[PDB]
Symmetry: C3
Amino acid sequence: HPVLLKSTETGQYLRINPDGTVDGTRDRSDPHIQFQISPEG
Amino acid sequence: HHHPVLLKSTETGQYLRINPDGTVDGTRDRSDPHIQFQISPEG
Amino acid sequence: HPVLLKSTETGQYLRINPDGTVDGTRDRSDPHIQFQISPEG
């Protein structure tokens, strides 16, 4: 059950591209915007 | 009622920011509206 | 309470580097992949 990280002011989702670059996109269906958040411990 | 959150680097103290042009960087300006995030389930 | 933000599609963790740049990495040992999540208010 992944989560999305959305900029509240711009509507953009955080994306990590395969090449390691990070940017924003408004395509909610892009699988590269899905995250798992877990404790470091 | 909304519940915006901030995402802060433990190493550098910088908050994640998405800029209108789609670029992503970090800032220590806690008042920058661009550092506010909504986290929600994809489902 | 530090957390990791991992892309499900590529296995990369979000990172803010010493110089402030944001990228993805699979280096689990880099302390730069640790984040704190807090309420804006």
